[PDB]
Amino acid sequence: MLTDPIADMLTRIRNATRVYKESTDVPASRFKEEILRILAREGFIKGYERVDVDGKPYLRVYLKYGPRRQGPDPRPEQVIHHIRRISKPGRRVYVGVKEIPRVRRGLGIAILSTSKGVLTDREARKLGVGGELICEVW
Amino acid sequence: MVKIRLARFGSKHNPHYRIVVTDARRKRDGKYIEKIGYYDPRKTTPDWLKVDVERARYWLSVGAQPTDTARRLLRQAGVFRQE
Amino acid sequence: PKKVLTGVVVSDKMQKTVTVLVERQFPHPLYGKVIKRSKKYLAHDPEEKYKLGDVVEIIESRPISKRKRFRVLRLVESGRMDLVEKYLIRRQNYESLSK
Amino acid sequence: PTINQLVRKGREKVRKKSKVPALKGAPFRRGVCTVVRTVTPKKPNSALRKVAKVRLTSGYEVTAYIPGEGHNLQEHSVVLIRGGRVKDLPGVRYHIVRGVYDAAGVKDRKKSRSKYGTKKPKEA
Amino acid sequence: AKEKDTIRTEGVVTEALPNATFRVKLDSGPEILAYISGKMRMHYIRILPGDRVVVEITPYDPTRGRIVYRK
Amino acid sequence: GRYIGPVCRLCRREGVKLYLKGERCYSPKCAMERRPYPPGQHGQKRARRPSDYAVRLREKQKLRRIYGISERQFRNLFEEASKKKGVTGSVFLGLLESRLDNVVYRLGFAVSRRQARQLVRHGHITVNGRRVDLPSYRVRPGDEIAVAEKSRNLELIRQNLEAMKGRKVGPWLSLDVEGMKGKFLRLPDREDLALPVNEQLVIEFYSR
RNA sequence: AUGCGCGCUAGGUCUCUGGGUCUCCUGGGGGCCGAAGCUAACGCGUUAAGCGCGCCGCCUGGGGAGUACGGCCGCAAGGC
RNA sequence: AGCUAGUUGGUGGGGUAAUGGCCCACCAAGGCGACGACGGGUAGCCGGUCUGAGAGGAUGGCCGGCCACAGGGGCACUGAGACACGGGCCCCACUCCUACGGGAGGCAGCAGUUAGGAAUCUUCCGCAAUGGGCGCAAGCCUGACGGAGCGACGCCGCUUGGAGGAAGAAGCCCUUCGGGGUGUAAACUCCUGAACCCGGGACGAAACCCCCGACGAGGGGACUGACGGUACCGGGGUAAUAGCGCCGGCCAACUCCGUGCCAGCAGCCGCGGUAAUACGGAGGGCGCGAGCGUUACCCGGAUUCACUGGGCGUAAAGGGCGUGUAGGCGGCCUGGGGCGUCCCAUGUGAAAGACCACGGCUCAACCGUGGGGGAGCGUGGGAUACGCUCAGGCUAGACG
Ligand SMILES: [Mg+2]
Ligand SMILES: [Mg+2]
Ligand SMILES: [Mg+2]
Ligand SMILES: [Mg+2]
Ligand SMILES: [Mg+2]
Ligand SMILES: [Mg+2]
Ligand SMILES: [Mg+2]
Ligand SMILES: [Mg+2]
Ligand SMILES: [Mg+2]
Ligand SMILES: [Mg+2]
Ligand SMILES: [Mg+2]
Ligand SMILES: [Mg+2]
Ligand SMILES: [Mg+2]
Ligand SMILES: [Mg+2]
Ligand SMILES: [Mg+2]
Ligand SMILES: [Mg+2]
Ligand SMILES: [Mg+2]
Ligand SMILES: [Mg+2]
Ligand SMILES: [Mg+2]
Ligand SMILES: [Mg+2]
Ligand SMILES: [Mg+2]
Ligand SMILES: [Mg+2]
Ligand SMILES: [Mg+2]
Ligand SMILES: [Mg+2]
Ligand SMILES: [Mg+2]
Ligand SMILES: [Mg+2]
Ligand SMILES: [Mg+2]
Ligand SMILES: [Mg+2]
Ligand SMILES: [Mg+2]
Ligand SMILES: [Mg+2]
C-alpha cells in the first residue's frame, strides 16, 4: 500500500532538497495540490505544475535553493531545512486556536488543514479556526 | 431549612464573614448555595460590609430565614427598607 | 437531554429485548489516536420489530431490568448484518485462546 | 513502538523499589542486638569494621554498621538504626546511629559530633 | 583517640584461605579468623601454613584477628 | 538574625570594596585599601582559577552582603521577582532596594546599613504615619519617610543629616534634609544603582 | 546476528534469469565498490542500517536466569 | 481466561416515596468477556497538594464536597429523613459487676491513660463572637466552635548591637623565623535600648431584649467578653543566646600535628600500608543561621517506560518462518451526511487553594475584596479541508 500520499510527497520533497535535484515528481491530489500552493505562497518552493508523466496525472515540483556557497561545503544553502508530516495517519493531531505552534518562533511555518480550507499558521490564527496539523516546515 | 447566615473565613483573632445562603444542616464553612455578601467585625476597611441586595431579597422571598446577626446586617445594608 | 446513541442490533435472543453495539470513537487520554470502542447495551422494544443486524437510534431511559436501561427510538437502516458479523467473529474467537 | 501498539499494551511503569526494608519506610527504627562483631571489608579496602546484627520491631534480623571510633555497645543493649548503605561491607544497609538509647556517643569527637550523639565540649 | 587495646599475641598458622585470610592457632589458645597485614601484602611476604605470626586482636571480637609480623 | 560579626572580612573574601561601615569604609580602613585579599591563612596564597558555579555563588554572596539579609529572605524575594512580569534581574534588585532599612540607609538617614536597620528596629523611623520597626518593609512608591518625633532629638540622626548635607541622593528618591523627612519617589531602577553585582550571574545561580 | 509492506533518494561493476528495435536498452534476482545521508564506530549504502509512512514483535544495568513458582504442551527428554 | 444460575430476559405479584432480578412464582435461555470479564493484590475518592519547562509523575495530611464505618457481624423499628456513633434487638469477641440465674459496657467526640511505636499535644478556659438545636421569648444546652497551653513541627518576622577604634594587643596557630593569620574582631570610647518595670488599654458587640412606630419598615435605649490586663500605645529602662554541617572531585572552602590499609570516613568515585588538601584533633576557611545536618518517602535530574521524547546489524533487544482472525491502517475523482474534527454562543466547571491587582493585621506570613482564566462535559447554531460514513465513478496498488 502507498500508505499515505501527503507524507510520501513530503518525503520526496525532502529527498529533492537533499540531493539538489531541481525538479521532482509526485502523484496528484486535491489536498497535495493545496499544500503545494501554500508552500509556493510562503516561498518554500519555486512553483508547482501538473504535467502528465506516463499516462497518469503527476506533479512537477520546482525546487528552491539558496545561493551556491563559498568555502568547504560549496553545496547550496538549503531553503527547506526540515519538513515533517506531524499528523501521521494514526497519531492524528488536531489543534484548536490555543494549540497552534508559532513554529520556529515565527520563521518557518506549520500547515493546517481546516474547515476554512488549507492554510498557514498566521492565517489560521487570524481566522481563529484550528484543525489538522498536517506538516511542520522550516 | 434555608438560612442566610455568616461564614467565618479569616484567621485566629482575625474574623471575616460571608453573608451566605445555605441549608441549616451544614458546617459553618460548608458548601453553600450562593455567596451574597461579606462583613468584617473589625470594620477595618472603608467597605467592611457589603451585600448584593437583589439576591438577598430573592432569597427572602423564597423563604430564606436569616439568622439574627445576618438579619441585622441586612437591615444595616438596606434590604428590609421598602420605599 | 436524554442520551441519544446510535448502534447496531447484534443479538435478539430475548423477549422484547435487543442488544446494541455502539461504536464510540474518541481520542486517547494521552496518545491521541482515536480509538473505536464498543459497549454492548440492552434495549427495550415492545414490538420485536427491530431484529438482528439492524442499525438503530437508542434512547436512555428509566430502567426495565438489571442492566436493561434503554428504549429503542427508531430504525436508521436495516439488514447490515455485515457489521454484526465482525462482532460474532470476535465472540467466536474468544473460544479459541483459553487452554 | 507505534502508537496503536502503545495504546494496546502500555508503557509498563517502573515501580522505583526501596534500597531499604527498615519496613514501612519507617525512617528510623529501634532494635535490639543479636551479635556484635568485627568485619573484614571488601577487595579494594581493608580494616576491621564495626557491625552489629540487630533484630527489629519490624521483626527481621539485619546488619547495622556502627560508626564513631569505638562503640560502647554490647550484646543485649537497645539501639537505633537510620539506614544507608555502606559500600565496603556486604549486605549492610543500615547505620546504627550514635546518640539515642544504649548507643551512647563518641567521646572526644569535637568536629562532626551531631552525627555521633556527642554533646558539646563544655567551655570555660 | 586510637584505642590501643589491640592484643598483640602470637600464633602458628594452621590453614590457608583466600585473600590472605588464615585460621592461625595461637600461643594464647584459640584458632580464629585472622587476615593479613597490608604491609606484608605490599612487601610480598608469603605467609605459609606452619608459621609463628603476630595476630593482633580486637577486644570487641577476638574471633577475627589481623596478621602483623612476618612469621 | 543578620550576618553580625566581622564585616570587612566579607569584603576581603568577595575581593571587592563594599561599604558597610560607611565612613571608615571610606578611609584607608575598609581593610581593602590597606589589605586587598581574602581572609584566613590562604588569603595571601596565590589565587586559583575558580568555577563558573563558584563565581556565581560568590556574586550571590556579594549581593546578599550588600543588603545584609538572611539568605532565605533573599531566596523568597527572588522567587517573588520570578513570579512577577518583566526583567527578573532589575525588578528583583528594585524590590530588594524597596526594603525599609535599605531605603533608610540610601536616603542618608544613616551612615551604615546595619546602623540604619538598628534604628528602624528601635522605632526611630516612621513611614507615612505609623512608627514602623520592621526593616523588611516593602516601601511602595510615592511614600514619605521621616524620623520619629520622639527620636528626632538624638545627635546621631543630626550627624547623619549633616553628612548628606553635602551629597546627592539616588534619583528614585528625594529628601527634606531640614525637617528630617524624605520621599521614596519612584521604584528604584537597577541602572540608578552602581552595584558590584552582575544580576545575570545571580539569576543563573538561583536557576537550579 | 538486520520483521514484513510500499514509496522516494548519484553511479559503476560483475553475476544469474526474462523481453527487446540483440555492440546496447529494459525488467526480476545474487554479489562487490561507492553519491547524499545515516551511524558509537565498524560499516550500511536502489537487495539501506538513508529519507518516510503503515503495522507488528520485542528492550529498559549485569549476574541472579532462561532459573524458580505457577500455567500449558509433551510418552519422557524438555520446551514455551 | 473464561465467568455467571437470581445468573440474563419476560408475565404477574410482593416490596419501595419511586424504577428495577430489590425480591418471589413460573416460562424463556441468555448475559458478560482479550475493546480484559471473573480472580488476587493494592486503595476511600475528589477539589486538591507536592513536583515538574510542559506533557506528565507521585500523593490525597489539614481545609471543602461526597462515600463508607462506628469492637466484628446481622437486622429491622421509629420516623420527613437512619438501616441510625454517645437509640433498640440478636449472635460473636472482649472488659466489668454477680447472692452464678444473669446483667452493663464501646473514646475511629474532646482531653487524657495505656499499648504499639522512631514519632505526635492540655484529664485547659468560655458560650463573648459565629453557627446548631429547642423554645413566644427570656433562656437553656453546644469539647461544633472561639481561644489559650504544649512541640523550632512547619512557614514567616525580629533579637543576640551600632558607630568609631593598630600598618595591627594579647591568647592560639602557622612559619620560609623576616613574617602572616585570626581581625576592626577585640579591649576601650560614644550612641541605641531586645529584654524588664510602671501608666493607660481595646477592636472584636449589636443584635436577639424593652418602648414609640401596627409586634412591619423605621427611631431611641440598655445589657452583653474566653482570649486578657494580652495586643498595643506613653514613660522609664540593661549590651543583652550561637549554633551546625562541610572543607579531594562532584561542590563553596586549606593548612598543621596526631594516625600509618590501623583507627576510621563514605552519597558515588574512592581515601588510608609514614610530610594523607579525603581518617582524629587544631587553627584557618566556606555554607547556612535559631537553626543546621542526617535518615526515610516522593518528584526531578531520568529523553532511565520516551505522547511532546528513545531504541532494536555488533551494545539489552526482530519473534524461526508461513498463512490468517480480531484489531490497527488505507490510492485517485465527484457528491450527499456531518459521527470524529473546528468554531461561535451559551450552560456547567462551587468556595478555599493556584493566578493578577488592591486592601488589612507595624511588614510578611496570613487573611480579605475584585477580576480573570481553567482542561473537560452538555445544549443550540454553523464549517466541510481532513478522517469516518453512504452513493457514483476511475485505473497508478492489488488480483487475473
Ligand atoms: Mg596494642
Ligand atoms: Mg511476520
Ligand atoms: Mg559521505
Ligand atoms: Mg558498501
Ligand atoms: Mg542503528
Ligand atoms: Mg533452553
Ligand atoms: Mg515448570
Ligand atoms: Mg414487576
Ligand atoms: Mg482480601
Ligand atoms: Mg486501606
Ligand atoms: Mg473532610
Ligand atoms: Mg459494629
Ligand atoms: Mg477501637
Ligand atoms: Mg416510616
Ligand atoms: Mg445517632
Ligand atoms: Mg513505646
Ligand atoms: Mg468547665
Ligand atoms: Mg425555663
Ligand atoms: Mg453539659
Ligand atoms: Mg480548635
Ligand atoms: Mg527565620
Ligand atoms: Mg566527616
Ligand atoms: Mg569529602
Ligand atoms: Mg579532616
Ligand atoms: Mg518516541
Ligand atoms: Mg537509548
Ligand atoms: Mg546481542
Ligand atoms: Mg482486517
Ligand atoms: Mg480514505
Ligand atoms: Mg474556584
Swiss-Prot record, chain A:
GO terms for biological process: translation. It holds the Pfam family Ribosomal_S8. GO terms for cellular component: ribonucleoprotein complex; ribosome. SUPFAM superfamilies: Ribosomal protein S8 (SSF56047). The keyword RNA-binding applies. One of its GO terms (molecular function) is structural constituent of ribosome. Part of the 30S ribosomal subunit. Contacts proteins S2, S5 and S12. This is Small ribosomal subunit protein uS8. The keyword Ribosomal protein applies. InterPro entries: Ribosomal_uS8, Ribosomal_uS8_CS, Ribosomal_uS8_sf. It comes from the Bacteria. Keywords: Ribonucleoprotein, Ribosomal protein, RNA-binding, rRNA-binding. NCBIfam families: PRK00136.1. PROSITE patterns: RIBOSOMAL_S8 (PS00053). One of the primary rRNA binding proteins, it binds directly to 16S rRNA where it helps nucleate assembly of the platform of the 30S subunit central domain. The combined cluster of proteins S8, S12 and S17 appears to hold together the shoulder and platform of the 30S subunit. Belongs to the universal ribosomal protein uS8 family.
From Swiss-Prot, chain C:
GO terms for molecular function: rRNA binding; structural constituent of ribosome. Disruption phenotype: Increased generation time and a temperature-sensitive phenotype. GO terms for cellular component: cytosolic small ribosomal subunit. The keyword Ribosomal protein applies. Gene3D superfamilies: Nucleic acid-binding proteins (2.40.50.140). CDD domains: Ribosomal_uS17. One of its GO terms (biological process) is translation. Keywords: Ribonucleoprotein, Ribosomal protein, RNA-binding, rRNA-binding. HAMAP family: Ribosomal_uS17_B (MF_01345_B). Part of the 30S ribosomal subunit. Contacts protein S12. One of the primary rRNA binding proteins, it binds directly to 16S rRNA where it helps nucleate assembly of the platform and body of the 30S subunit by bringing together and stabilizing interactions between several different RNA helices. The combined cluster of proteins S8, S12 and S17 appears to hold together the shoulder and platform of the 30S subunit. NCBIfam families: PRK05610.1 (NF004123), uS17_bact (TIGR03635). Belongs to the universal ribosomal protein uS17 family. This is Small ribosomal subunit protein uS17. It comes from Thermus thermophilus (strain ATCC 27634 / DSM 579 / HB8). The gene is rpsQ.
From Swiss-Prot, chain D:
Coiled coil: none annotated. GO terms for cellular component: small ribosomal subunit. One of its GO terms (molecular function) is tRNA binding. Pfam families: Ribosom_S12_S23. The methythiolated Asp-88 contacts a modifed residue of the 16S rRNA close to the decoding center, and might be important for decoding center assembly. One of its GO terms (biological process) is translation. The modification 3-methylthioaspartic acid is found at D88. Residues 105-124 are annotated as: Disordered. The keyword Plastid does not apply. InterPro entries: NA-bd_OB-fold, Ribosomal_uS12, Ribosomal_uS12_bac. Keywords: Methylation, Ribonucleoprotein, Ribosomal protein, RNA-binding, rRNA-binding, tRNA-binding. Residues 108-119 have a biased composition (Basic residues). Belongs to the universal ribosomal protein uS12 family. With S4 and S5 plays an important role in translational accuracy. Part of the 30S ribosomal subunit. Contacts proteins S8 and S17. Interacts with IF1 in the 30S initiation complex. This is Small ribosomal subunit protein uS12. The gene is rpsL.
From Swiss-Prot, chain F:
GO terms for biological process: ribosomal small subunit biogenesis; translation. Its cofactor is Zn(2+); [4Fe-4S] cluster. Keywords: Metal-binding, Ribonucleoprotein, Ribosomal protein, RNA-binding, rRNA-binding, Zinc. GO terms for cellular component: small ribosomal subunit. InterPro entries: Ribosomal_uS4, Ribosomal_uS4_bac-type, Ribosomal_uS4_CS, Ribosomal_uS4_N, S4_RNA-bd, S4_RNA-bd_sf. Zn(2+) binds at C8, C11, C25, C30. Residues 98-160 form the S4 RNA-binding domain. PROSITE patterns: RIBOSOMAL_S4, S4. Transmembrane segments: none annotated. CDD domains: S4. Coiled coil: none annotated. Binds 1 zinc ion per subunit. In a number of structures (e.g. 4Y4O, 5FDV) a 4Fe-4S cluster is seen in place of the zinc cofactor. One of the primary rRNA binding proteins, it binds directly to 16S rRNA where it helps nucleate assembly of the body and platform of the 30S subunit. Binds mRNA in the 70S ribosome, positioning it for translation. Part of the 30S ribosomal subunit. Contacts protein S5. The interaction surface between S4 and S5 is involved in control of translational fidelity. Belongs to the universal ribosomal protein uS4 family. This is Small ribosomal subunit protein uS4. It comes from Thermus thermophilus (strain ATCC 27634 / DSM 579 / HB8). The gene is rpsD.
